[PDB]
Each structure stands twice: as C-alpha cells, then as structure tokens.
Amino acid sequence: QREKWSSKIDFVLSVAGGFVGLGNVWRFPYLCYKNGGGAFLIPYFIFLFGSGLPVFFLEIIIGQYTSEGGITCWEKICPLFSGIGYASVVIVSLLNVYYIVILAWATYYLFQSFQKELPWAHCNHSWNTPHCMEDTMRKNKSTNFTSPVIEFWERNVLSLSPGIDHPGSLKWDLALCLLLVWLVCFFCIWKGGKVVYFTATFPFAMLLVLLVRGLTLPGAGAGIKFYLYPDITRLEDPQVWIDAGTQIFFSYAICLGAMTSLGSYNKYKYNSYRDCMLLGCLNSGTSFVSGFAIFSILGFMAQEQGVDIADVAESGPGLAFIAYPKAVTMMPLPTFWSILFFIMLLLLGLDSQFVEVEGQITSLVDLYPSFLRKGYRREIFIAFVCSISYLLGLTMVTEGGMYVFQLFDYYAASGVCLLWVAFFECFVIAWIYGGDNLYDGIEDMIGYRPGPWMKYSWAVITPVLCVGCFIFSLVKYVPLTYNKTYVYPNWAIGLGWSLALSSMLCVPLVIVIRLCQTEGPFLVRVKYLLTPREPNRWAVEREGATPYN
C-alpha cells in the first residue's frame, strides 16, 4: 500500500533538499574551523569515499527493496536487529529538537536586516561593550577588543550567559522566532510544481555569490591556504577523526531513518545507483565549495583585524553567523544581500527540516497505521509531535541555552550515537543478511549487478572505521568544551551521554525484548529472529519482482 513518486523527479528533488542544508553551509565550516582546517579534510574524504556514500546508497536500497519506512524495513531485513530502526527514530527526534533552533537564529537575523543599517556593522549600539571597536580601526593602535559582528552575535542574538548553570530567562524574540518556524513547518507538512524549482536553485545561486565575494576579497589567500593545507599532529588527534566521521553521517542524513523512508516510495525497478551517486557528489561538492566561501571570508577578517586566522571567530556553532554577516557588509547594498543570504539559509534549513520530520512522522505512523492514520488522528499526532519538539526545544532559547545547543550538537544526532547505528546497519546487511543476497536484490531492481565497491564498503571499511573511531575516542577522551574556554560541569556531560545512550541502547534493548518474547531454545529463537521474513513481499506481489533467495 506504499505510495510511489511521480516522474522520478520528485524523489531526486526531495533527496537533494533533504540532505543538503545547514549541515553543509553551517556545520561543516564550523567543524573544519574548530579542528584546524586542512587536517579536517583528510578524515572527511576517508569517511566520504569509504563510507557515507555506501551507507546512503544502502539506506536507499533498503527502503526501495523492502517498500517500508525507517522501522519496518529492519523488521523485514533482520527482525532481531529491528531495534536499529527504533534507534534511528530516536536520533531524528533529537535532531528535530535542536536543528530547527538554528533557523530561529536565522529568522532573528532576518528580522534584524529590515532596518536601513545592519545592526552588526557598528560598535555604537546599546548592547556593545566598551571593548567593542570597529575592525578597520582595530588593526591600528589587559588589552583586548571584540569585533562588532561577534558582539552582535553574543550580546544581542544569543544573550550568552556565564555558563549552562545559569539559563537566565527565556528570550522572547528567539522563542517567538522558533514558534513561527515550527508553525511554518507544521502547516507545510500537515497540509502540503514550478515553485519548488526555485527553492532548490536560489540557494546555489547565493552560494555562488558568496563564493565570488570571498574569492575576490583582498587577503583571501591566507584563508584558502588555512582551509587546504593539513596538519599531521592534528591528524594524530582522535577528535578530528570522530568529528569528520560524524559530519559525514550527519550531512548525508544517514542513521536517521529518513533516507530509507525517502527511498521507500521509489519504484522497485529504478536505477537508483546513478541517482544516489550524483546527488551524493552534489552534497559533497556543496560542502567542499562552501568551505572555500567561509574560509576566504575568515582570511579577510584575520587580515583586516590583525589577528590569527584561527582566533577571529567562534570555534563552536555560529561561525556561519559571524563570518557570512561580515562579508555581507562588504558588498554594495548590504541589506539586500543580507536578506537574500538569510532567506537562502532559511530555505536550506526548512527543506531539510520538512524532509526529516516527514520521515519521522511516516516511521511513527507505520507502527500503528490503523490508529495513528485512520480518521483524522494523523493531524493531531503531527501537531502533538511538533508541540512536544517545540517545548523541548525552548531550553536552547534561554540566555544560557546556547551551551545546551552544543550539548545537543556534539552528542545527540552526532558523535558515537551515529557510529553505533552505522556499525550495526552495515554489520547486519553485510554479515547477517549477506552482501551477495543484497547484490542480487540490487541486480533485480536497478537492472545490473554493481561493482565490488558497495560490498567491501559495507563489510570491511565502514565497520572498521566506526570501531576504530569509537576505540580512539574512548582511549583518548577530550571533554566537550564550548569555544575552547568553557568547561561543562559533570551533569552537562552526563546529559550528553544520556542523549547519546537513549538512541544507542535501543539496539540491544530490542534484541533482548525479541529474545525474551520468542520461545523455544535460545538457538532456535536466534535462528528464527535472524531469518528475513519476505523482505520484499509487497514488491513481489505488486510488481513483477523476483522472490528473495
């Protein structure tokens, strides 16, 4: 009874809009700048060509073959590890909490651009500290200054607190912006062409404009050089490897249960290998090229401020909110380009949020189709999920909430919680299910048996990379720090560990539940739970699909 796309273009557009966005223009530059720059790229490419792309194609193929969402697909493929799907849902749930907060910030920035003079271009505003000085005069002539862009980002937008211990009050403006963005998402998903042909083209046009401005900026060679040339000693730090590996999985929206849902509506006989490789190349190119735009602007900022290239902005989240607003003021008619850039950011975030929330809602409804979809209950369930995600998301809107955002960024829907899923998705498919059986299924679907790249990537490369990163992170533990200065308390790291474990522990918990529920000897129960029960029964009966095995 699964739906099918139309003309096969809707699927491509949905995928492209779902796995490109804030993870390419916001998270990637800030992670690259936090890890030293060029040293971040080598693990990025190692996890990009040995994994990430194969895992993305695996999720798409699982969705298309099983014709099931993010949960039932693993029930069909391997019942015993069905909890993997549950874990994915948990991850996306947490991702739906903090990933939209960024849009609120963007919305606030947009609501700040409607005035004649951009508020982040002078130090004479009320919120500025006496240490604020204009960057042009900062180079000339117990002595520290703060750039007006960073002053606006910290004092006005974030209203940052001494620490996560002090949350302060709720920022009414940011809370209203978050509520507006949640209302937009809920109205779009609940109830809702050539219009969409310009909602995935304009962001790329603005990216091109930013690229041009950054490249033509004076003193941008230092920024490009900091971005490219790597450092071996930083490659010897496990933090770079784990950050790059988890950025690869975050950007491609894998281990979330969303890409599987997107692929579930594909036709059974549809060459999704090319359509999943071209889009993956587009996503990687978007990230890599936007890195140039961010780092050329950072190099110009460092040249004009007279400071180090790595000491001109925030190592944590908000680099895109300190760098791009600076280059915006360097272009003629700064207000026009500020509005355009923040509209681009809003589009890139809203499309991804729509895709992720749609995947989560589809996966949750598939559990109880006759109760949570029958009648009018679907609307009520979507409203309840959005309201809960909004209320649980107001903890990052308070004055001391920015730190909470980082706790969600580093641990929830990232970090080892991704690896834990990525190891299990590839282990079940390659070893328990069988790489050759899935290759036969792919040969039946796309028309030709692929090369040995996918099989080796699922079997050897991805599990080894995930377990090596896990072991390296555990052996050499670097506690999470905000902007290289803040030290989270014990309970903050405990909360981050709890957020990670909430999704991580779903895989063994469901295994235990299945083992206890099944009767007979343990060996018999394991054999029963490790046997896929008609993985493509719907595809076999509906279409002319060949039976599994």
- By beta-carbon proximity to Cl ion, the closer residue of 21 and 435 is 21
Are the CB atoms for 296 and 220 separated by under 8 Å? yes
Q: Beta strands of 91-175 (E only): which ranges?
A: none
Q: Which stretch binds Na ion (CB under 5 A): 105-113, 243-251, 412-420, 429-437?
A: 243-251
The yes or no reply on residue 292 touching Cl ion (CB under 5 A) is no
* Per rule CB under 5 A, count of chain residues that contact Cl ion: 3
Minimum distance of Na ion from residue 321's CB (angstroms): 18
Site for Na ion in 2-31 (CB under 5 A): 19, 23-24
Q: How many CB atoms lie within 10 A of CB 520?
A: 10
Minimum distance of Na ion from residue 232's CB (angstroms): 28
- By beta-carbon proximity to Cl ion, the closer residue of 28 and 482 is 28
> After which residues does the chain show a gap where C to N exceeds 2.5 Å?
141, 192
Minimum distance of Cl ion from residue 206's CB (angstroms): 18
Minimum distance of Na ion from residue 225's CB (angstroms): 25
Among 11, 28, 420, 427, binds Cl ion (CB under 5 A): 28
Say which entry of Na ion, Cl ion, none residue 96 contacts (CB below 5 to 8 A, set by partner kind): none
Q: Which stretch binds Cl ion (CB under 5 A): 112-120, 261-269, 286-294, 338-346?
A: 286-294
The yes or no reply on residue 329 touching Na ion (CB under 5 A) is no
Among 51, 113, 260, 287, binds Cl ion (CB under 5 A): 287
Site for Na ion in 416-475 (CB under 5 A): none
The yes or no reply on residue 38 touching Na ion (CB under 5 A) is no
Q: Which amino acid appears at position 526 of this protein?
A: V
The yes or no reply on residue 315 touching Cl ion (CB under 5 A) is no
Site for Cl ion in 224-283 (CB under 5 A): 251
- The secondary structure of the chain in percent helix, strand, coil, rounded to multiples of 5, reads 70, 0, 30
The yes or no reply on residue 251 touching Na ion (CB under 5 A) is yes
Minimum distance of Cl ion from residue 294's CB (angstroms): 12
Helix ranges (H only) for 428-461 are: 435-446, 452-456
Residue with tokens 């090596």: 468
Query: Which tokens in the block code for residue 530?
Result: 């490790």
Segment 523-532 long-range contacts (CB within 8 Å, at least 24 positions apart):
526/80, 529/78, 529/79, 529/80, 530/78, 530/79, 530/80, 530/432, 531/79, 532/76, 532/77, 532/78, 532/79, 532/433
Minimum distance of Cl ion from residue 164's CB (angstroms): 28
The yes or no reply on residue 349 touching Na ion (CB under 5 A) is no
Say which entry of Na ion, Cl ion, none residue 28 contacts (CB below 5 to 8 A, set by partner kind): Cl ion
Q: How many CA atoms lie within 13 A of 158 on its CB side?
A: 25
- By beta-carbon proximity to Na ion, the closer residue of 257 and 441 is 257
Minimum distance of Na ion from residue 31's CB (angstroms): 12
* Per rule CB under 5 A, count of chain residues that contact Na ion: 4
Q: From the DSSP assignment, how many helices (H) and strands (E) are in the chain?
A: 29, 2
Query: Which tokens in the block code for residue 27?
Result: 């998270």
Q: Which of 40, 16, 43, 14 is CA-nearest to residue 28?
A: 40
Cα distance between residue 371 and residue 393, in whole Å: 27
- The contact set with Cl ion (CB under 5 A) reads 28, 251, 287
- The contact set with Na ion (CB under 5 A) reads 19, 23-24, 251
